[PDB]
From Swiss-Prot:
Part of the ABC transporter complex OppABCDF involved in the uptake of oligopeptides, including the cell wall murein tripeptide L-alanyl-gamma-D-glutamyl-meso-diaminopimelate. Plays an important nutritional role and is involved in the recycling of cell wall peptides. Binds peptides containing from two to five amino acid residues regardless of their sequence. Also binds cell wall peptides, such as L-alanyl-gamma-D-glutamyl-meso-diaminopimelate. Keywords: Disulfide bond, Peptide transport, Periplasm, Protein transport, Signal, Transport. InterPro entries: Peptide/Ni-bd (IPR030678), SBP_5 (IPR039424), SBP_5_CS (IPR023765), SBP_5_dom (IPR000914). This is Periplasmic oligopeptide-binding protein OppA.
Length: 517
């Protein structure tokens, strides 16, 4: 943390953050969500990290070079250590990226190495070559070299993500799936794991072996798993929570802006809220049905009337303000809702649905006051506008993600936030073979458009291809875009270091500090 001249620090440097839900895991290769990544950034540190404003910056690698954007060489700082005192080396990264790639690990983020185009990853994911053929090597203990199959000028931006953080081989190998328990885990970030009580709390304590430990200020941070946004706000206002999770309750938000304006942080956020359609399950394999659902949803009611927190009506998957996005707003988005409603009704009537044999399906969401309120509103809008019936179903976070991967669903509430600020951080998840493709969308036309983006060495041609890829996605109505998020959360006045400037919201508790109060 960089504490400004003249700020008086509190004697007690502890922080309590709400984290939305119980994490899927603390293993960097088994996680895919925001709550998981929130904890992962304090415990495991990769090659690069985001600074306090979100720019990719030195992490374990103090400096790096690239040859033709294909061969990337990372110079690892000599004093990088794990919490047990042992050095962090390039061998740790070699083992770790191989483990990520290995199909036996079944990482939801195995395809992150396809997004970076690391040599031989397609063959490794497919079981054709062993994980040891991945194009990574330790040239020495402090030098990690990555070889890509084609030039990727933005490759280094990918490297702040938890899936490419190192994991300690000896603990993994010795304890298997219990390696992340507090008695066994070993970490290389600014913190170490102290306590982990499922559905209660995660408590982290400063890691004195962290190379940048002298600049860490917070000695202990607790992450809570509260999925009720009302409850989070309540325990924030009671004094227990210093930073809410960034999901705000419809019940209280308007009141909060008038009651504690200075605590209500609202900043840009590269995330999209949408209804994910299971594209492989009838009748959702019919484009007429998917298009009907997309068009009948009334974003103006949802965004400005029911939620009204500053979100923007969405017409794409990639947020339009992503670095490199130059998207074309489709003509349907400019129509009246009435006109969208008629076309929708028309498509379902065309698809064989009637008042007597209507369209009935489930709407799955992760337990939340916000998602439940939005799902009820969407259910009523779809009922009223299109005559479709929906059965709402909530599931806890971890189970919810597994259901989507399983494909044991119809429609699910969903949100995707960028892992790196470039359109492919969204678009790559809709590739036929992506491990993150829970829409189960498979389009050769879409796959080809994205494959072509690294076959040109021109930024405008690349941006035109992303725009066309979004148009392919939209034409197929793979999903139902709802709104682009704003990052809205409450932060006590004594919490220093949170700028709100990072559109990815990659917070590190090592950058924060408690002001005397
Ligand atoms: U004190
Ligand atoms: U650049
Ligand atoms: U940029
Ligand atoms: U269903
Ligand atoms: U509620
Ligand atoms: U460039
Ligand atoms: U105080
Ligand atoms: U105090």
């Amino acid at each position: 943390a960089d504490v400004p001249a003249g700020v008086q620090l509190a004697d007690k440097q502890t922080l309590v953050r709400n984290n939305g839900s119980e994490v899927q895991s603390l293993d960097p290769h088994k996680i895919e969500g925001v709550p998981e990544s929130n904890v992962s950034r304090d415990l495991f540190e990769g090659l690069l990290i985001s600074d306090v404003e979100g720019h990719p910056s030195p992490g374990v690698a103090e400096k790096w070079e690239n040859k033709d954007f294909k061969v990337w060489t990372f110079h690892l700082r000599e004093n990088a250590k794990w919490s047990d005192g042992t050095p962090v080396t390039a061998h740790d990264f070699v083992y770790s990226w191989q483990r990520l790639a290995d199909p036996n690990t079944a990482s939801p983020y195995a395809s992150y190495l396809q997004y970076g185009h690391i040599a031989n990853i397609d063959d490794i994911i497919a079981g054709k070559k062993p994980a040891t053929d991945l194009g990574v090597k330790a040239l020495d203990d402090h030098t990690f070299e990555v070889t890509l199959s084609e030039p990727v000028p933005y490759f280094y931006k990918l490297l702040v993500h938890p899936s490419v953080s190192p994991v300690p081989k000896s603990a993994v190998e010795k304890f298997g799936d219990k390696w992340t328990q507090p008695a066994n885990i070993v970490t290389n970030g600014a913190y170490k794991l102290k306590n982990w009580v499922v559905n209660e709390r995660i408590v982290l304590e400063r890691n004195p072996q962290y190379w940048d430990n002298a600049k860490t200020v917070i000695n202990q941070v607790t992450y809570l798993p509260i999925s009720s946004e009302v409850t989070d706000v309540n325990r924030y206002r009671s004094g227990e929570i210093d930073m809410t999770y960034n999901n705000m309750p419809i019940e209280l938000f308007q009141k909060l802006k008038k009651e504690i304006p200075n605590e209500v942080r609202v900043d840009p956020y590269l995330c999209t809220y949408y209804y994910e359609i299971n594209n492989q399950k009838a009748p959702f394999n019919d484009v007429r049905v998917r298009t009907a659902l997309k068009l009948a949803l009334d974003r103006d009611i949802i965004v400005n009337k029911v939620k009204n927190q500053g979100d923007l009506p969405a017409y794409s998957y990639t947020p339009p303000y992503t670095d490199g996005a130059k998207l074309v707003e489709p003509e349907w988005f400019k129509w009246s809702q009435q006109k969208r409603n008629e076309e929708a009704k028309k498509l379902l009537a065309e698809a064989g649905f009637t008042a007597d044999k209507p369209l009935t399906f489930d709407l799955l969401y992760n337990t939340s006051d916000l998602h439940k309120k939005l799902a009820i509103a969407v259910a009523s809008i779809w009922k009223k506008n299109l005559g479709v019936n929906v059965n709402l179903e909530n599931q806890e976070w971890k189970t919810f993600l597994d259901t989507r991967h399983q494909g044991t669903f119809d429609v699910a509430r969903a949100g995707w936030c960028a892992d790196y600020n470039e359109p492919t951080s969204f678009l790559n998840t809709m590739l036929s073979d992506s491990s993150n493709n829970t829409a189960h969308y498979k389009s050769p036309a879409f796959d080809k458009l994205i494959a072509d983006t690294l076959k040109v060495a021109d930024d405008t041609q690349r941006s035109e291809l992303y725009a066309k890829a979004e148009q392919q996605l939209d034409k197929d109505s793979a999903i139902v875009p709802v709104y682009y998020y704003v990052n809205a959360r409450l932060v006590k006045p004594w919490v220093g270091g949170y700028t709100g400037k990072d559109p990815l919201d990659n917070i590190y508790v090592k950058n924060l500090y408690i002001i005397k109060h």
